[PDB]
């Protein structure tokens, strides 16, 4: 009579009973379980990250942010289970609210009414307003990072690529490599941006809105440059004014080498869509990042007027800041920090 386990080792102690296997995404296994102290069901992710410094970094980054954020539309951490000492710590179990599906799975099977689209978009932007008010960027918004329950409450998860906004350090070269999901990448990422400003998240929300309207990705590039050619195929060739903002010579001259394309109007792509939804889509999917709509303006758009209420759309109490920088640290110091962050949940 000892440690529990389906398929392998999943020891989660006095509190959590009645496990059932759910899947294995990026790094570690997921299971449901019965929280005895609160008498609800919950999700538990086993993370085993100490053997690769990249997983350690995403794990700490995420733990710090989620512990400080407190918002209805952002996933919480209810509990963290690890060994009592640093030498015995090989795994970490993260306990979160159980959510029945996500938007990726939902869009594979269901078509959405206009009321569902409106309300889902509202909740995304309400969550995003809070994230942006703390000066944080998500950077990997996509349908599988939007979790849903059976009553249609929406929560944003997966802050593994999140960063503090830093517009003064956004510029980079043409064709610089990028880690986030290709189909939801803003055009400036392939041209001149590292993705350190708020406008990259708004682009991704734009993509998600199009996907909710039609059940398929709007810019399904097969590789790094094909992504850019999908975008230009719909939005058309950028104007002189927009081109003059791109100082980077290699990017500008690539863009000048392409044949002229006219904008495809949105109502040709989405003939059943509400007219106000297409007007918002258009302001989100703007080629120039500086003319792209901000989160507060999107919330105040007519499409969302039955929900918009700024007194019920909280902002963070203070801006978020990493004291010390996680990109320049070895896997042994990271382990020790994960240990320290997770101390408050120890009996």
Curated annotation (Swiss-Prot):
Summary of the tissues where the protein is detected: Highest levels within the nervous system, expressed in different tissues, mostly in muscle, thymus and heart.
Active site per the UniProt annotation: 140
SUPFAM superfamilies: Protein kinase-like (PK-like)
Modified residues (Phosphoserine): 20, 237, 239, 275
Modification after translation, per record: Dually phosphorylated on Thr-176 and Tyr-178, which activates the enzyme. Phosphorylated upon FLT3 and KIT signaling. Ligand-activated ALK induces tyrosine phosphorylation. Dephosphorylated by PTPRJ at Tyr-178. Autophosphorylated on threonine and tyrosine residues in vitro, which correlates with a slow and low level of activation. Phosphorylation on Ser-20 by SGK1 results in its activation by enhancing its interaction with MAP2K1/MEK1 and MAP2K2/MEK2. Dephosphorylated by DUSP1 and DUSP2 at Thr-176 and Tyr-178.
UniProt domain Protein kinase: residue ranges: 16-304
Record PTM Phosphotyrosine, positions in chain: 178
Domain notes for this protein: The TXY motif contains the threonine and tyrosine residues whose phosphorylation activates the MAP kinases.
Subunit-level organization: Binds both upstream activators and downstream substrates in multimolecular complexes. Interacts with ADAM15, ARHGEF2, DAPK1 (via death domain), HSF4, IER3, IPO7, MKNK2, MORG1, NISCH, PEA15, SGK1, and isoform 1 of NEK2. Interacts (via phosphorylated form) with TPR (via C-terminal region and phosphorylated form); the interaction requires dimerization of MAPK1/ERK2 and increases following EGF stimulation. Interacts with MAP2K1. Interacts with DUSP6. Interacts with ARRB2.
Protein name (Swiss-Prot/TrEMBL): Mitogen-activated protein kinase 1
Gene: Mapk1
